[PDB]
Design a protein around this ligand. Structure first.
Ligand SMILES: *[C@@H]1O[C@H](CO)[C@@H](O[C@@H]2O[C@H](CO)[C@@H](O[C@@H]3O[C@H](CO[C@H]4O[C@H](CO)[C@@H](O)[C@H](O)[C@@H]4O)[C@@H](O)[C@H](O[C@H]4O[C@H](CO)[C@@H](O)[C@H](O)[C@@H]4O[C@H]4O[C@H](CO)[C@@H](O)[C@H](O)[C@@H]4O)[C@@H]3O)[C@H](O)[C@H]2NC(C)=O)[C@H](O)[C@H]1NC(C)=O
Ligand SMILES: *[C@@H]1O[C@H](CO)[C@@H](O[C@@H]2O[C@H](CO)[C@@H](O)[C@H](O)[C@H]2NC(C)=O)[C@H](O)[C@H]1NC(C)=O
Ligand SMILES: *[C@@H]1O[C@H](CO)[C@@H](O[C@@H]2O[C@H](CO)[C@@H](O)[C@H](O)[C@H]2NC(C)=O)[C@H](O)[C@H]1NC(C)=O
Ligand SMILES: *[C@@H]1O[C@H](CO)[C@@H](O[C@@H]2O[C@H](CO)[C@@H](O)[C@H](O)[C@H]2NC(C)=O)[C@H](O)[C@H]1NC(C)=O
Ligand SMILES: *[C@@H]1O[C@H](CO)[C@@H](O[C@@H]2O[C@H](CO)[C@@H](O)[C@H](O)[C@H]2NC(C)=O)[C@H](O)[C@H]1NC(C)=O
Ligand SMILES: *[C@@H]1O[C@H](CO)[C@@H](O)[C@H](O)[C@H]1NC(C)=O
Ligand SMILES: *[C@@H]1O[C@H](CO)[C@@H](O)[C@H](O)[C@H]1NC(C)=O
Ligand SMILES: *[C@@H]1O[C@H](CO)[C@@H](O)[C@H](O)[C@H]1NC(C)=O
Ligand SMILES: [Ca+2]
Ligand SMILES: [Ca+2]
Ligand SMILES: [Ca+2]
Ligand SMILES: [Ca+2]
Ligand SMILES: [Ca+2]
Ligand SMILES: [Mg+2]
Lengths: 359, 113, 115, 593
């Protein structure tokens, strides 16, 4: 029984050792310290996923000021700041939308609004360094509408997170998915009402930047959603204007790597929300282990800068740059019968541990 | 279609007074599917094109000061100006967009002497 | 900033036809419908018609059919209101407008006088 | 533990119809034969102008295995005015929800739309067809003048239904009143009597229903799923209703008074978005004469030791006590994303032990996510948390998971043996499968040693062949057996008796049978069920002290028994099973002093 830490040149700047190899026997255990050191001045990819149902038009008009002002503020938190954009409304099926032939294209009945046809999820702008292009894409965004209060937020999020080749998420970046709304989202089983009884397979289904399984697959569960967000290393920021903010806030414990804040009634704090949320996310370090190796168990304790200890994926808070967090990782074998991955949530680097066994 | 009745046709005010004017629809302007009342108020100064003040009964438009408050529901809507200014002497109109767009007669504010 | 620019004043005799233009700028023309509103010289506003700039399909108010027509020239971002068989009752200022709440706008108003 | 999973009855419908989406049993009061009811909500019917209207099929069982549609509705879309349709039946999902009480079959179409008379709209009001005798009527409790979002316009009535033993129909309409949801309950007699095909909105006089409430209750979907049972001791079945998005998406289950709809009880979920209340059921699971409440929460995430959340699914089980209080425990599922608890179906007393048993599905579990159904036995202390039997789906996905276990119904005995059977749908493959319950045999196996105490010098008998004197003792064993339902009169048993086996293989056994000079003996026994214990006596002797590991040890006397399973079968080839909660291995000890 042993633990080997490679002395080869490392290929990770944040999480080290990025490769570990151990040898176990039943009843035996081995351990090591995993170091996680957050960096300063990350490349940052910020994608704006916006609820564009009629109730949101008041917040959408403020995204015209966000482009340049946010870019300036982020200059002190990032090295390379890119913006993207997309939108969602709901599933385009009864009872969520009108199916009347004269009102299929224009869900709203307010004759002062030439509203957009409803859609599940549409990608509008790939992540780009060009701020003007972002503002342009926003300026020309039209408002839609639907009938039922809740929106198809979680379904759009999964596609935005999964369809990496379309969004243009960089590996070399802190990936941020910002979701703007005012209402709560639909759940996976709510879709039964529309006659949708087929589970979301978690895959990417975009054609011409449009989600086309939106009417045949149900909404993803929180389980599926957190799994995909963590797997694709995407941090999520919720920006909610209504009283429903608290609904989203109280789901945070179920969705690791997620933060939420409030949009003011005047929607004057959109940039402050993003910057503050960014600063809060970068200050929290927690890990989880993906263990597919049968007979192996893990017990990880975080050791924080103040000497306190926090078990499992509770992690450490009020962490800065030039500040290392240690994770005390013990691996034990209980029974005879591959590798496991230990990774910080919201980080691109992972530590792969290979487990060799004999009995 | 929907006839909007606005009253009074003229209302004299003194600067600093609270002034109210109202508009009554022929039918409900409330959209059961949105819970919103599709009524808006406009201000028209003489010699100028009109400007939107309030939409959806009580939602205030950008650039409009908070002395202009809208309220009401169903068929009965009110526009109230708290501490009316000398610059607010204009004709105000109620508009509905529940069906085809339609305007009321309008209320002209006059100054007391 | 969205602007709407209308043609200048028109003077017509009874029975004549007038075509009033409204040129749009600051937004994509085909994005929002164009509304026309009639203001008689001393009365309130009357909505006349709207045209969907994407499809060219007009909708008229009950009191303004037959004598009124609305058309588009999308290549020049311009909407037109045509009034046939002008009567003395048609004297008014005719405005073109966008009522989209996020960004409403009005033209300067075209003055039409019928002798 | 007694379902036959080797020889089930398999049924199938048209491809893409979702045959098996919803299942029930059809048992006419005096037809002598029974049918299965299997829905197919997307089926292409022969109706003039209706696409994927949906249908319900009546499936036979004895002899061959064939299904035929029930003509609840054999027409097209009725007009309101020339070239102006009143109703839209295409894609109405008829057969999505089916229930039957004896001869009465109620089948619903939750996605049925109509225009209303006031304006030309298309609202998903929902309708049901009630068939009894030779008459069929349309029941449309939400097709009223109270329309649109603030009314019943988006009701989707018929989304979920049940029957009240008092001959009332319980119907959930989750979209009523801004999706607050509504329960509507009416009499069968009123529904059938007050019917006129020229009237679209029909009032009933003995109708009960929930009403509107404050906007704080919007988007709760009350009436998502319903069940019935007596929760106040009035002799009148009350109404149990899931409200999965209630209380800030914790989910709730409400129980309303079956006589006047006053609310009686309120159950709440613990975890947001677990969708507590997805499905509900009620049954007496502990023999207390009080209905117990079973509430599913298919998306529940069970936190592990490291803080990781695994989506497994949970079922909350609460027992009703005389005081009106409930005693609640929690049953967690077994597999991630299997959605355990998405379907709950009381089986009645499946194993005839005096307590009702229940099936809980996990439609996306098992290998390849074929779907699993878990059978849990009841008992006086509440449901046994450990499943006794696991049923796996038998088909591969073609475009979507078979979703075996998505819909289930039990507590009906089709093969007429006293043990109720279970129908399980698997709509992803357009199939339905009926599992039949095997008879259960309780066995009384006795073993005695005369005397248990002996020694090497206590020579009491002689060996066969050559009369050498040895120490001896007698070992007796006997067996009686019976069951409660229809079992073969003659039960063929195999028994084996072993002596002094508690030692290393190859070791010398000291206690041997006289006639065989052997540590083992077996016999073919025929036991009349309900008869006398059949007894046998074998004589054992000890080897002397020339061949031994020790002189003073315990002697184990061990008996094992099992069924033959070659002659033990009824006319359908259904074999009985031994009670799985009893040992078939018993022992006594003898000692050398
Ligand atoms: C299981 O859980 C459910 C909730 O999920 C619970 O049912 C709810 O019960 C409450 C009452 O406790 C319902 O709230 C209201 O109840 C009053 C009855 O009178 C009581 O409350 C008033 C007001 O506080 C007191 O003055 C009085 O002394 C009593 O305590 C009803 O009269 C209310 O009706 C309103 O709605 C009607 C139309 O829908 C209106 O016509 C009527 O005027 C009321 O309007 C109110 O709201 C208006 C704003 O929308 C406001 O402008 C009005 O002025 C007024 O305030 C109302 O029913 C609540 O609705 C029930 N919810 C549901 C979903 O049924 C069960 O009791 C509980 N069961 C168990 C066993 O625990
Ligand atoms: C950033 O995006 C803007 C907007 O597309 C680019 O500016 C345009 O440049 C083209 C010529 O290639 C002109 O025809 C357009 O009229 C310009 N638009 C505006 C709004 O000014 C700009 O060049 C891009 N910059 C970079 C570095 O990619
Ligand atoms: C994770 O993100 C970091 C950036 O914070 C990446 O590190 C950079 O990689 C590029 C490409 O080799 C170098 O040019 C930069 O100088 C590196 N930055 C620093 C601070 O060293 C890292 O490569 C990413 N990880 C993975 C696996 O892609
Ligand atoms: C990391 O965890 C290990 C235990 O897995 C700690 O090692 C133990 O330290 C205590 C106190 O000195 C000894 O009594 C144990 O015998 C040690 N353990 C084993 C398992 O051999 C280690 O000190 C921890 N490191 C930090 C930095 O907290
Ligand atoms: C019921 O009939 C409809 C109409 O024929 C079938 O839907 C068609 O399927 C074909 C093959 O994929 C398409 O090319 C047609 O365009 C579809 N038509 C319509 C109107 O959807 C439907 O699949 C049939 N369903 C069942 C269960 O048999
Ligand atoms: C994991 O470590 C914690 C201390 O942080 C300890 O309390 C817990 O019992 C350990 N768990 C296991 C399974 O060893
Ligand atoms: C904890 O956070 C506060 C800001 O909320 C900061 O001022 C303080 O210095 C932090 N503490 C440490 C030890 O970094
Ligand atoms: C419903 O019936 C029960 C009978 O016990 C009675 O106590 C209760 O007050 C009744 N409620 C209503 C609303 O009639
Ligand atoms: Ca919606
Ligand atoms: Ca009762
Ligand atoms: Ca009970
Ligand atoms: Ca039982
Ligand atoms: Ca049976
Ligand atoms: Mg919305």
């Amino acid at each position: 029984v042993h633990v080997i830490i490679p002395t080869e040149n490392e290929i990770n700047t944040q999480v080290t050792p990025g490769e570990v190899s151990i040898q176990l026997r039943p009843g035996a255990e081995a351990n090591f310290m995993l170091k996680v050191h957050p960096l300063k001045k990350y490349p940052v990819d910020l994608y704006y996923l916006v609820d564009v149902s009629a109730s949101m038009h008041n917040n959408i008009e403020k995204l015209n000021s966000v482009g340049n002002d946010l870019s300036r503020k982020m200059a002190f938190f990032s090295r390379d700041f890119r913006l993207g954009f997309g939108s969602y409304v709901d599933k385009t099926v009864s009872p969520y939308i009108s199916i009347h032939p004269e009102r299929i294209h224009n869900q709203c009945s307010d004759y002062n609004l030439d509203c957009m046809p409803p859609h599940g999820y549409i990608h509008v702008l790939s992540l780009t360094e060009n701020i003007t292009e972002f503002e342009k894409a926003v300026h020309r965004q039209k408002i839609s509408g639907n009938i039922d209060t809740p929106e198809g937020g979680f379904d759009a999020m999964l596609q935005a997170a999964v369809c990496e080749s379309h969004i243009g998420w960089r590996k070399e970046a802190k990936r941020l998915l910002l979701v703007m709304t005012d209402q709560t989202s639909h759940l996976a089983l709510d879709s039964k009402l529309a006659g949708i009884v087929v589970p979301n397979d978690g895959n990417c289904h975009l054609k011409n930047n449009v989600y086309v399984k939106s009417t045949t697959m149900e909404h993803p569960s929180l389980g599926q959603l957190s799994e995909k967000l963590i797997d694709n290393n995407i941090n999520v920021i919720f920006a909610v204007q209504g009283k429903q903010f608290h609904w989203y806030k109280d789901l945070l414990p179920l969705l690791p790597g997620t933060i939420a804040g409030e949009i003011e009634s005047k929607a004057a704090n959109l940039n402050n929300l993003v910057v503050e949320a960014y600063q809060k996310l970068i200050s929290e370090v927690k890990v989880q282990v993906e263990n597919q190796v049968q007979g192996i168990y893990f017990n990880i304790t975080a050791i924080c800068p103040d000497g306190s200890r926090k078990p499992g994926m509770e992690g450490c808070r009020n962490v800065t740059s030039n500040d290392e967090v240690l994770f005390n990782v013990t691996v034990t074998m209980k029974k005879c019968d591959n590798y496991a991955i230990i990774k910080p949530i919201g980080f691109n680097e992972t530590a792969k541990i290979h487990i060799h066994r004999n009995c | 279609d929907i006839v909007m009745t606005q009253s009074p046709s003229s209302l004299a005010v003194s600067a600093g007074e609270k002034v109210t004017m109202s508009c009554k629809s022929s039918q409900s302007l409330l959209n059961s599917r949105t819970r919103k009342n599709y009524l808006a108020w406009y201000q028209q100064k003489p010699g100028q094109s009109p400007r939107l003040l309030i939409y959806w009964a009580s939602t205030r438009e950008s650039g409009v000061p908070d002395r202009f408050t809208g309220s009401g529901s169903g068929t009965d809507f009110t526009l109230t100006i708290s501490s009316v200014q000398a610059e607010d002497l204009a004709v105000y109109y109620c508009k509905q967009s529940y069906n085809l767009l339609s305007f009321g007669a309008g209320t002209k504010l006059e100054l007391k002497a | 900033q969205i602007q709407l620019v209308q043609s200048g004043p028109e003077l017509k005799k009874p029975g004549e036809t007038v075509k009033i233009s409204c040129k749009a700028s600051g937004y994509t023309f085909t994005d929002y419908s164009m509304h026309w509103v009639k203001q008689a010289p001393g009365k309130g506003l009357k909505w006349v018609a709207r045209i969907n700039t994407e499809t060219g399909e007009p909708t008229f108010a009950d009191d303004f059919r037959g004598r009124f027509a609305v058309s588009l020239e999308t290549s020049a971002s311009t909407a037109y209101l045509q009034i046939n068989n002008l009567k003395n009752e048609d004297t008014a200022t005719y405005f073109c407008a966008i009522f989209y709440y996020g960004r409403d706008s009005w033209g300067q108003g075209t003055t039409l006088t019928v002798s | 533990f007694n379902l036959d999973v080797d020889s089930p009855a398999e049924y199938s419908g048209p491809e893409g119809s979702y045959f098996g989406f919803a299942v029930d049993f059809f048992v006419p009061s005096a037809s002598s034969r029974m049918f299965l009811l299997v829905g197919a909500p997307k089926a292409n019917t022969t109706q003039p102008g209706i696409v994927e209207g949906g249908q319900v099929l009546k499936c036979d069982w004895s002899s061959t295995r064939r299904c035929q549609p029930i003509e609840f509705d054999a027409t097209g879309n009725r007009d309101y005015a020339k070239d102006d349709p009143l109703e839209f039946k295409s894609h109405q999902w008829f057969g999505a929800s089916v229930r039957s009480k004896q001869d009465k079959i109620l089948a619903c179409a939750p996605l049925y739309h109509w225009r209303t008379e006031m304006k030309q709209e298309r609202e998903p009001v929902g309708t049901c067809f009630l068939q009894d005798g030779t008459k069929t009527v349309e029941y449309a409790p939400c097709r009223s003048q109270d329309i649109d979002a603030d009314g019943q316009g988006f009701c989707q009535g018929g989304f979920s239904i049940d029957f009240t033993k008092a001959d009332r129909v319980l119907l959930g309409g989750p979209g009523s009143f801004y999706w607050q949801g509504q329960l509507i309950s009416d009499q069968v007699a009123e529904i059938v009597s007050k019917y006129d095909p020229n009237v679209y909105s029909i009032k009933y006089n003995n109708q009960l229903a929930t009403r509107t409430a404050q906007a704080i209750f919007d988007d709760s979907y009350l009436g998502y799923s319903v069940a019935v049972g007596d929760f106040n001791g009035d002799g009148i079945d009350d109404f149990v209703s899931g409200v999965p998005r209630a209380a800030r998406t914790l989910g709730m289950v409400y129980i309303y008074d079956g006589k006047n709809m006053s609310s009686l009880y309120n159950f709440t979920g613990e975890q947001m978005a677990a969708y507590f209340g997805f499905s509900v059921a009620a049954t007496d699971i502990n023999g207390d004469d009080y209905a117990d409440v079973f509430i599913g929460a298919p998306l529940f995430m069970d936190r592990g030791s490291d803080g990781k959340l695994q989506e497994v699914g949970q079922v909350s089980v609460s027992l009703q006590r005389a005081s009106g209080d409930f005693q609640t425990t929690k049953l967690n599922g077994f597999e991630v994303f299997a959605r355990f608890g998405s379907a709950i179906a009381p089986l009645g007393d499946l194993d005839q032990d005096g307590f009702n048993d229940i099936a809980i599905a996990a439609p996306y579990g098992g290998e390849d996510k074929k779907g699993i159904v878990y059978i849990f036995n009841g008992r006086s202390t509440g449901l046994n948390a450990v499943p006794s039997q696991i049923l796996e789906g038998q088909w591969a996905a073609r475009s979507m998971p078979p979703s075996f276990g998505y819909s289930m119904k039990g507590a009906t005995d089709i093969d007429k043996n006293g043990y109720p059977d279970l129908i399980v749908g698997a709509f992803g493959v357009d199939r339905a499968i009926l599992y039949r319950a095997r008879p259960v045999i309780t066995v009384n196996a006795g073993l005695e040693v005369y005397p248990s105490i002996l020694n090497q010098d206590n020579k009491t008998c002689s060996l066969p062949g050559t009369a050498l004197k040895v120490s001896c003792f007698n070992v007796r064993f006997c067996l009686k057996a019976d069951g409660k339902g229809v079992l073969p009169r003659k039960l063929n048993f195999q028994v084996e008796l072993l002596l002094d086996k508690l030692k290393q293989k190859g070791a010398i056994r000291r206690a041997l049978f006289l006639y065989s000079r052997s540590p083992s003996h077996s016999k073919n026994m025929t036991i009349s069920r309900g008869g006398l214990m059949q007894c046998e006596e074998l004589i054992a002797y000890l080897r002397d002290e020339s061949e031994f590991r020790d002189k003073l040890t315990p002697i184990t006397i061990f008996m094992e028994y099992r069924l033959d399973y070659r002659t033990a079968a009824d006319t359908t080839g259904l074999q009985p099973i031994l009670n799985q909660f009893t040992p078939a291995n018993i022992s006594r000890q003898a000692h050398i002093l």
